[PDB]
Symmetry: C2
Amino acid sequence: DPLRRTGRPFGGLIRDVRRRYPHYLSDFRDALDPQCLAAVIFIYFAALSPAITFGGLLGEKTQDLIGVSELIMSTALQGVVFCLLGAQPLLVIGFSGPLLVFEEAFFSFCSSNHLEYLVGRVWIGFWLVFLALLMVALEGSFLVRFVSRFTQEIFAFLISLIFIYETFYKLVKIFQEHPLHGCKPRGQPNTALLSLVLMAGTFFIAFFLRKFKNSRFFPGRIRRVIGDFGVPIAILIMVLVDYSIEDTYTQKLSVPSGFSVTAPEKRGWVINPLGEKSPFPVWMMVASLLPAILVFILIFMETQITTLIISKKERMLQKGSGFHLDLLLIVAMGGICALFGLPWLAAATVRSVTHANALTVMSKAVAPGDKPKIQEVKEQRVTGLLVALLVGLSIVIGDLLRQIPLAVLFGIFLYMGVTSLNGIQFYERLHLLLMPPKHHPDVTYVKKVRTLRMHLFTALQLLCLALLWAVMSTAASLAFPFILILTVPLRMVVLTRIFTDREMKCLDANE
Amino acid sequence: DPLRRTGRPFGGLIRDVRRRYPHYLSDFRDALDPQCLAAVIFIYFAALSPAITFGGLLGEKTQDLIGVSELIMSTALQGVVFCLLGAQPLLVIGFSGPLLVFEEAFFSFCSSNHLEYLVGRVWIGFWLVFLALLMVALEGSFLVRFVSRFTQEIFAFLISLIFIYETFYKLVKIFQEHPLHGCPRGQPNTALLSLVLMAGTFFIAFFLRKFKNSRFFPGRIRRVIGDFGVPIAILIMVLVDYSIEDTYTQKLSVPSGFSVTAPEKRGWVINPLGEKSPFPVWMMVASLLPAILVFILIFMETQITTLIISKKERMLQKGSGFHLDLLLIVAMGGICALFGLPWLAAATVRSVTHANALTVMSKAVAPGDKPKIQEVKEQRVTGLLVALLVGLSIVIGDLLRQIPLAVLFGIFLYMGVTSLNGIQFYERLHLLLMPPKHHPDVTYVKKVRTLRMHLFTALQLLCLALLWAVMSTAASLAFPFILILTVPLRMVVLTRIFTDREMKCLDAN
């Protein structure tokens, strides 16, 4: 039982480091497989594009204090260190929306009170390091055992839905800059339709090859190899198709040139903790505790729920996962990186899920029946390290990257968002709403539960998800982790009162 | 078996006419059931669009006014009289692909010279009447039994391939008139909007077809929504195009009012007596072979449709018809060819949709296996209400002028793709590249070796390749002649190569 209170200081840390580290050479040996190369190529773009997007947003919202170069360097360094010393290497760490919101709010607060920003974040990093050390010393990470399936699925569904909304929203903003009138550049013709065509083509080739992977045509080995390289082949085909056209203008991937600060005239690579230009007030040094607590809560909840979803019993993970030597590493790396002005990072749920299920191997079942189960996952320490190094050295190259339009990557992002949905029981119970009761499958939560007492569960969980989305989209979105935490007392009290014991045991269980 | 000879010249016609007409009142009375109205709606929506789009291609290709209006009024005129004075009033008389391919070639041939024209077409049409009368009098309708599965599936596959290829030829011809350069022969957003529209309509129709037989919704609503796939896709795409403010897209070209030979004096009737130049003898007395080829096409299509619809499994009590339908179709087409208009045949897809939409289901508490005997709503009303409603849609040209021309091509692609299901040539062609251990449990895979089955499929593909090659290059007016000599091939060569057991499971009725 990984989530057990030993009763001794650093007990969980020692248990994790003795459970995972013996299987070290096995991780580097398991990487010899053509599937690993496809996983690397698939995840490189999915880890590079959000870095550029969020770097541009952060640079425009912070007066070019933190930009694209800093975010790329931070992601590379933190990913390399984590994949070299982490307990669970199937995690992809990167910048996200809540971190951006917190950074912009802190910048506004610092500007309002005439305080330094980069110097101010150093003390937040120090307090994060102290809090992480205190929590690991007291082995307080055993509280994850109280996060049931009722909360692991709302979080996953909400994150995967936002990933799809923000992908359809990037095409409306293209159609709004080049409208169909007829006659960085603006108002060009044939651009919006070309972007739509490229995105649709990439997405449809992705599903076509995914379907062909599990088909009956061709020999087995060729079929599996071709089905593994679905995303790279789709990307290559659509990039070549766009390269053939010579006159129409399409937006293309842009990266900065040279490892340098975005604003070298007002910033350096090293921040003095006590003062840059004017001395830093003493009171803020001890009043910075609250933002540290808030960002610690954000990082902790995100990383722990992602690890919980990844380490389910259905997904055959055998080497083991560490709930203690993950938070310590992530928070310590963030606190150290804050001293150099680089941003903080947390595990990305959709990227981690995609990375995990792009390495699974499915067994060969009989012709009739349901979907064949999962045989193995094939985890290792090589893919994440390679992806981090590639993202780090994505600056020296970039004359090659300038030929890849953004429209092509939208299809890959839509494919990722759609594929990441399957596997959670909330989605299947949402499917069961439409079907008539005589067509329901022979699953364990429908035979022992009345049909009308499962739709009530689904409706309550949808209500919780809608409330969460409404709270996130309003002006005060910094309370989102607290609202996410508040569902646990809901399940332990209100759902216990409304439902009976047997229904609660059947509907949401460990397995 | 109706396909027997009694020695009497008109013996088959007499036997067939004294089999349904005595039951005229029975066929004409019981038509008040509400189940027929839904079938009529389905037939109208499944038959209106192919007629209008085929007429559009005729008008844009022939350079003579045979566009939309001519074909619609032809279909209505043929259908009304067929329903009144014809036996087996379940056949739907529609324009098919092979007739397009043949008459395009004939018009190209007559334009290569300068003395054939529509008057030459009329001289073609007269020989149809003569030859049909001769064959019905001689009672040669029994030749249907000599055309087994080996030829029907080749014909169907070739027709589907031609149907598919013509859709991808207009896309290539729309990226050339309006290229994709920067800043109607060049309008900017015309080349890609058409592709978007046709892809959208094809995908919507395909998804509705897949959803029809799914596990969602009560099932009656599911079947109703799945029935309206093509109309719903067409409506959605035409609304989407109407929402766009300023972008050139080609629309339908139906003429308003009754129009024929606009830059010419004479009316609908065509005079085969020297309108412009004297017509020599050997372009009307030797103008008989294309009549033979058209007769072969019509005869094969109509008789195979009648065989398909009148099987023992599709139980039928009133009676069948094998001679009078052919006589009526060919003679009436030949007579009406001198009013312009295209020769018209009986298509099987619409007919079987009529048959299974007018058929009562099992109506049993036991799990469903196949539709039981129940009753069949044999009527002469659901054909008339379809033909008249199709033919009166010529004063509504204002609404049809807003339809984009790419949605129709999406519908062509959908029909050509969905018509490939049900012919054993297609499943054998699929099996040609599966591993041998994954082959299904059909009857023609256990009793014959894999190599012999693949040899049969490869031998059946060479005939298709030869027909495709001869259909295009220069002898496009002789492709119905190879579909005739493909019967002696199976008669002698296939028997000499294959054994008796293999050519009883591979080629089975």
